[PDB]
Amino acid sequence: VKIYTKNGDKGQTRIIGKQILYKNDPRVAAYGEVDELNSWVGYTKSLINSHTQVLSNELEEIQQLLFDCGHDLATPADDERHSFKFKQEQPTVWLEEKIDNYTQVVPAVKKFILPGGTQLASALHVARTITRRAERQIVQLMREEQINQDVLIFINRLSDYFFAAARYANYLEQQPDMLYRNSKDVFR
Amino acid sequence: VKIYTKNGDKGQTRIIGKQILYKNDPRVAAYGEVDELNSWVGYTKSLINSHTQVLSNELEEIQQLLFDCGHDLATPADDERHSFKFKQEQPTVWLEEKIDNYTQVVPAVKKFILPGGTQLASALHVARTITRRAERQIVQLMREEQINQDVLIFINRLSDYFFAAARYANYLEQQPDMLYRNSKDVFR
Amino acid sequence: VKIYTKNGDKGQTRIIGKQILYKNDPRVAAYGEVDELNSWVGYTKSLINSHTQVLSNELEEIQQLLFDCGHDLATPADDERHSFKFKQEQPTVWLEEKIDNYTQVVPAVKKFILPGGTQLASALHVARTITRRAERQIVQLMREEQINQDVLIFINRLSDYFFAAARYANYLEQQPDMLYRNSKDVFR
Ligand SMILES: Nc1ncnc2c1ncn2[C@@H]1O[C@H](COP(=O)(O)OP(=O)(O)OP(=O)(O)O)[C@@H](O)[C@H]1O
Ligand SMILES: Nc1ncnc2c1ncn2[C@@H]1O[C@H](COP(=O)(O)OP(=O)(O)OP(=O)(O)O)[C@@H](O)[C@H]1O
Ligand SMILES: Nc1ncnc2c1ncn2[C@@H]1O[C@H](COP(=O)(O)OP(=O)(O)OP(=O)(O)O)[C@@H](O)[C@H]1O
Ligand SMILES: [K+]
Numbered sequence: 032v033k034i035y036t037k038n039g040d041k042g043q044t045r046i047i048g049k050q051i052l053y054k055n056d057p058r059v060a061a062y063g064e065v066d067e068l069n070s071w072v073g074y075t076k077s078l079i080n081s082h083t084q085v086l087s088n089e090l091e092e093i094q095q096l097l098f099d100c101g102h103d104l105a106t107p108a109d110d111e112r113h114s115f116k117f118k119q120e121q122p123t124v125w126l127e128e129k130i131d132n133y134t135q136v137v138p139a140v141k142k143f144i145l146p147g148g149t150q151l152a153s154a155l156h157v158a159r160t161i162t163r164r165a166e167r168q169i170v171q172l173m174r175e176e177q178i179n180q181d182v183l184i185f186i187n188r189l190s191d192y193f194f195a196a197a198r199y200a201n202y203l204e205q206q207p208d209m210l211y212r213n214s215k216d217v218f219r
Numbered sequence: 220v221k222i223y224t225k226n227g228d229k230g231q232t233r234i235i236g237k238q239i240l241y242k243n244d245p246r247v248a249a250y251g252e253v254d255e256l257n258s259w260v261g262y263t264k265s266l267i268n269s270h271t272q273v274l275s276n277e278l279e280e281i282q283q284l285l286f287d288c289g290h291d292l293a294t295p296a297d298d299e300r301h302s303f304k305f306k307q308e309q310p311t312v313w314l315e316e317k318i319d320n321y322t323q324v325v326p327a328v329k330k331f332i333l334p335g336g337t338q339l340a341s342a343l344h345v346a347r348t349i350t351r352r353a354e355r356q357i358v359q360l361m362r363e364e365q366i367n368q369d370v371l372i373f374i375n376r377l378s379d380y381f382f383a384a385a386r387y388a389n390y391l392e393q394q395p396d397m398l399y400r401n402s403k404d405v406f407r
Numbered sequence: 408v409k410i411y412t413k414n415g416d417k418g419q420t421r422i423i424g425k426q427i428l429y430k431n432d433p434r435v436a437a438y439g440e441v442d443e444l445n446s447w448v449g450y451t452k453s454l455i456n457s458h459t460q461v462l463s464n465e466l467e468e469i470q471q472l473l474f475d476c477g478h479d480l481a482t483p484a485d486d487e488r489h490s491f492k493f494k495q496e497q498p499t500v501w502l503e504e505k506i507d508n509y510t511q512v513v514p515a516v517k518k519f520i521l522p523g524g525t526q527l528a529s530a531l532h533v534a535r536t537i538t539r540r541a542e543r544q545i546v547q548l549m550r551e552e553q554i555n556q557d558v559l560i561f562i563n564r565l566s567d568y569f570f571a572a573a574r575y576a577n578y579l580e581q582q583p584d585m586l587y588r589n590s591k592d593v594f595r
């Protein structure tokens with residue numbers, strides 16, 4: 032079992048189906064960024080402590096979902112042999128219930144917060160912004176190729192999830208959020 | 220209060236003013252990368268310990284400044300309703316005094332250093348390179364649209380600040396820097 | 408000694424040789440991403456503990472090699488004054504022996520694993536995906552300019568190294584890997 036095949040040494044790689052693409056192709060970038068997010072989520076999960084244990088399981092669940100998302104991003108819409116498997120409905124509602132819960136429990140802001148606080152909250156804000164980077168790449172792909180739009184819906188919602196969870200993480204250790212000092216009242 | 224509006228589910232988003240852009244638009248990428256840097260800085264700040272407490276306040280200050288920078292990056296130069304608020308002068312001189320101080324105190328190198336050392340120093344080198352990534356995106360934007368050039372000045376200087384602070388962080392725990400073994404004498 | 412020259416304040420910068428490029432130029436991005444990887448590796452190394460000490464030296468070695476790689480990426484192929492110095496052969500075989508060893512020792516999977524586990528294993532998966540991001544940028548450069556193809560070979564192999572090392576890191580603390588629940592048997 033050798034994970035190195037050396038077939039990518041010239042800069043091309045296989046997607047799902049028969050097509051090979053350059054490694055910088057917008058599709059390869061899209062699921063590559065999802066993979067980087069997925070690794071970051073694993074890193075974030077590794078920072079869980081006794082105050083923040085309640086977040087551990089859902090972070091693992093998100094990793095499972097990001098594999099499902101990446102699968103579809105790797106799959107051309109006109110590949111006869113492979114189909115999209117990701118359905119946004121249940122995963123996205125699941126995220127929304129957590130955003131709702133976490134928004135309700137934490138102290139309310141009007142103003143932008145500094146992305147920071149505890150190590151876990153800060154890692155969740157990093158997750159938030161990597162998710163947003165991945166989303167930009169998914170949009171890049173979408174503008175050139177037919178994608179499963181369900182992935183974009185979920186990935187969009189997911190960065191709201193990470194924002195909400197980051198604030199929740201601070202709340203779980205009673206670390207106050209800090210406000211952006213020049214912020215207008217932006218959350219309504 | 221629902222932070223999820225679902226208006227971005229199709230890949231477009233509002234900037235400051237009335238314009239909507241695709242999420243992968245160079246402007247949205249520019250302030251998105253600034254936001255990722257901002258989250259990283261929060262993460263770096265969360266790693267401060269009793270040896271490195273002297274760096275905590277300025278890292279928070281940098282977060283405030285990155286919100287000011289992102290505001291202007293989000294604002295088209297011909298938006299009648301919104302103006303640039305960021306002025307580079309004082310923030311950049313403030314960075315320069317710290318670069319000066321930190322450069323003076325730490326052991327002098329000629330040669331490239333390995334970006335590493337303590338956890339905080341290493342996080343500061345990560346900050347350095349995320350700042351540089353954000354700067355590249357700001358330049359991408361600048362080549363297509365009129366930006367507040369003050370933001371570029373500050374963001375340029377900021378990666379020098381993170382280099383200097385990373386070396387300072389090592390010095391604060393008396394962790395020696397390691398040299399790149401094939402380095403020419405590059406700092407003069 | 409002032410590391411800030413202010414010459415890049417307008418968005419252009421020098422490469423090796425006489426050429427100046429915009430900071431978002433594909434070459435500047437390529438070695439800039441290598442620099443971000445290099446900083447991440449330093450961060451990963453800073454997470455080493457008594458269980459994982461055996462990985463510390465090779466991570467430092469990888470930092471040395473990434474400087475060698477970046478040098479060549481910074482060097483145009485037709486620069487009369489500067490030459491490529493990186494040779495892939497020995498560094499890449501060195502990576503392969505470690506991939507082999509680490510693959511052999513850890514429990515075998517068929518299926519995709521969640522990128523996660525201990526803090527160090529998770530950081531190694533982050534390294535894996537930053538390496539892959541850098542590789543995409545190196546390919547972007549290659550499609551426009553003649554590069555030292557040895558760098559691409561090594562950088563390709565390196566993300567396999569980080570995958571193998573991440574699994575090894577889990578094994579060193581006896582943290583089980585978790586499988587992607589919808590994975591097909593992909594490793595053969
Ligand atoms: N740099 C990269 N960024 C994102 N995705 C990649 C990258 N390289 C390959 N891929 C995708 O992820 C899968 C696994 O990567 P892998 O390294 O095995 O591919 P490869 O580089 O083509 O092969 P090899 O590394 O054996 O030469 C590939 O089949 C491809 O779909
Ligand atoms: N992926 C992204 N990367 C960077 N910036 C973004 C991204 N998506 C939106 N933005 C910018 O940041 C602000 C807040 O993001 P937000 O998620 O609220 O926007 P949206 O995705 O358009 O809306 P929603 O998530 O409610 O559907 C936006 O108004 C826009 O200026
Ligand atoms: N944002 C960036 N991303 C990646 N590489 C960069 C970036 N800016 C400069 N470089 C490269 O790295 C080297 C060091 O960066 P440095 O900040 O010293 O350059 P500069 O911005 O042109 O100068 P200064 O910061 O003094 O105005 C440069 O010579 C150039 O090769
Ligand atoms: K491989």
Ligand SMILES: [K+]
Nearest residue numbers: 191222223224
């Ligand atoms: K939102």
Ligand SMILES: [K+]
Nearest residue numbers: 379410411412
């Ligand atoms: K500089």
Ligand SMILES: [Mg+2]
Nearest residue numbers: 187188190227
């Ligand atoms: Mg959104």
Ligand SMILES: [Mg+2]
Nearest residue numbers: 375376378415
């Ligand atoms: Mg500079």
Ligand SMILES: [Mg+2]
Nearest residue numbers: 039563564566
């Ligand atoms: Mg490969």
